[PDB]
Amino acid sequence: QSTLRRAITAAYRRPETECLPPLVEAATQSKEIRDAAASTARKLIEALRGKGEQFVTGETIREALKRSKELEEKGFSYSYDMLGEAATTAADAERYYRDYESAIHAIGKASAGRGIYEGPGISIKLSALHPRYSRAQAARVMGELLPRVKALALLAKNYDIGLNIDAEEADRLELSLDLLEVLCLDGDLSGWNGMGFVVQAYGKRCPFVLDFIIDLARRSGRRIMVRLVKGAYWDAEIKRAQLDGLADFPVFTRKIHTDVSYIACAAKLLAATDVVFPQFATHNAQTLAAIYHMAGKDFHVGKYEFQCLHGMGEPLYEEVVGRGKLDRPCRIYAPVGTHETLLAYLVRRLLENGANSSFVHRINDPKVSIDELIADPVEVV
Amino acid sequence: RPQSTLRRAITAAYRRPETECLPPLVEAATQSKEIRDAAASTARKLIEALRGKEQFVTGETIREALKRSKELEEKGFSYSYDMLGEAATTAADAERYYRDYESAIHAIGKASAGRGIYEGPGISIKLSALHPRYSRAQAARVMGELLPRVKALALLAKNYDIGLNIDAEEADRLELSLDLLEVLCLDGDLSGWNGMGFVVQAYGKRCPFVLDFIIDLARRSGRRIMVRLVKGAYWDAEIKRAQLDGLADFPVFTRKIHTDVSYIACAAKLLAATDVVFPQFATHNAQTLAAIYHMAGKDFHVGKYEFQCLHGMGEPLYEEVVGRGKLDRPCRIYAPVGTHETLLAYLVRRLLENGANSSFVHRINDPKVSIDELIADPVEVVR
């Protein structure tokens, strides 16, 4: 318990109208940056509007590694996702653990010393590693989970690759955050900056989680890799919240509020690149353009990166990566597994790609003008 | 208590152990070796035809959907229209869905133009669209407000002589929906109309006992109830809910081939009661289809039974079924009508259907699945 931790817990269900004013202020950019970002966004969208096997990079990590070489020389990197989540039995959790373990050895050998920014990494889900992750007591879940995650982190340290903890349901944020803190203070993992953590901008706690993580990085000496996403579980969080009879939800209910929150949280991360490695995971060209200009003219590999999903982000990020474009790197989140393990991920991709509010749907909607696509969320909210 | 024995048998099955549910289903689903050989031949033909050849919505409005239906109706298909909408969260939403169904019935009834409930189009409704807290509110309140709304829609359907089907949703809603079916079937204001329909899900342990109740209800009500037999659209959600609820035994089967056996056993029950029910075999699985086609025997007339399929999924299969030169059996297409603002939840149920490794529509495209396996009789696997 700390002042920074208390700020997180107090924001859990803070009323939506009270969360927004500080995010709007932090998300407000100068006219000069807004004009530049509108110009860049227009160019990206005009290029775009000239453009489940699609979502899986390979059935095995050996296959996925072989298929990554082409895009790696173009300037992309990878984070591999061994598909599987919500273990319901001990045997399932054990299988998922072994898949992560064998993936780290293969990825680490493939990395061949390229390090955590130039070379590939791995993403894991805590719900794959504990048989009753959502339905068991937090103190117990962390107690059996910690040895398994630390063991994987130690393997990632051995090869100097990134290891990212994906973000799942809102009611498991606090548990996963406690695990991150223990790992960052663990002396056995010293000198390795590959530990990564996802934060979801549709959550009311997002800016306070970031404050805690930025301070944790600074006092632990770990340059925590922070993947900023908007959030993949919105419809499930709304349904759970309505069932709980709550007046105030843990997530925003208007898409524009999530967009403002993302920009505000990006500004927070870009002000802290000394101690964290921001990873801006988005397929929205307006979001990308805003962050590109917010980051300033100074750039080096390891300052920050963008990220996208395999099979979704390549049309946009082909206009970003490389010296003929914006010369900024992008890490591709690469699912690996069978069609069976793919289903839950696929469903989330459908809720993303099929929603009228999604950038990837609007970009192909003849009713949606380019002027609307480059609107600054602060000016519209 | 009225129908005590039949009602007690439904309750007893609700969470009966899976191993105990199966032996009676396996026996009733066992067919002779000759029929199995003939069904294997038909299924092989259908799959060889299949493997040798927004997608889910028929139109944004009922007018557009009705216009788009003419081509397949000319071929021998019929339609059941689904105004996309379910799980109303506000009383205003329920009233909106009611008015959507009401106006659709007028439009479908005009288009039917007196063709009747078997040759002409009908409508499908979801009770969760018509009550704002359908899953959460006490049965007394849900029944007392829902029953006048569904009766009013049924009266309009009667006035145009079209079918009106109550879709099946989550397992904990079965009891209420069945009580409503009974009250409507005994309501004299609906006399002379056989268009009331009801879905039963074969992945549920209660399915054969629900069918017993429905067949007896048809006998005592004088209504020929339309019964759509489906396997079930909510499997992943039912498993998750039962886990959360702390149940030791689930209300649905957990082995996919058990659902297949349940379906064939229940088809056998329905096919022996066609005097008082109209069976509607909703499936995209060519092996299931072939099994029922041969189970039903050589005598057929339109109105005895029909097959059904979902728009954008089943037409390639049933193009090999409808029509004199094929199997000469009718198929009713379930036709969603709406926009993105109501389409996602149906898409998700369709993706969970289409994306699952155990689904026929996935296996037909799987290179590791032989035609031998696709035509295998699931009853032999469990016998």
Ligand SMILES: Cc1cc2c(cc1C)N(CCC=O)c1c([nH]c(=O)[nH]c1=O)N2C[C@H](O)[C@H](O)[C@H](O)COP(=O)(O)OP(=O)(O)OC[C@H]1O[C@@H](n2cnc3c(N)ncnc32)[C@H](O)[C@@H]1O
């Ligand atoms: C690119 C990427 C995304 C995600 C992850 C990694 C990478 C590289 N990551 C791993 C995969 C898990 O699914 C991850 C994600 N989400 C999550 O909760 N935890 C994780 O560990 N990833 C998905 C990500 O959150 C997001 O859903 C997509 O990238 C789409 O976002 P994007 O910025 O591309 O698109 P926009 O269309 O501008 O926004 C879509 C998002 O907006 C939110 N939304 C939609 N309606 C809303 C209403 N009515 N109120 C509030 N918020 C709303 C949603 O978050 C929606 O996804």
Ligand SMILES: Cc1cc2c(cc1C)N(CCC=O)c1c([nH]c(=O)[nH]c1=O)N2C[C@H](O)[C@H](O)[C@H](O)COP(=O)(O)OP(=O)(O)OC[C@H]1O[C@@H](n2cnc3c(N)ncnc32)[C@H](O)[C@@H]1O
């Ligand atoms: C054709 C059709 C289908 C459905 C409906 C109408 C019509 C005309 N109807 C309305 C649409 C609602 O979503 C309806 C359906 N389902 C339902 O519960 N209530 C309804 O009112 N419809 C869908 C239908 O149930 C079904 O899901 C599909 O047709 C697919 O089944 P089909 O016979 O085509 O294909 P198979 O692939 O042989 O079987 C798939 C089914 O098997 C079950 N399953 C999957 N995993 C299982 C495990 N592990 N154990 C047990 N059973 C399992 C599921 O039922 C799965 O759908």
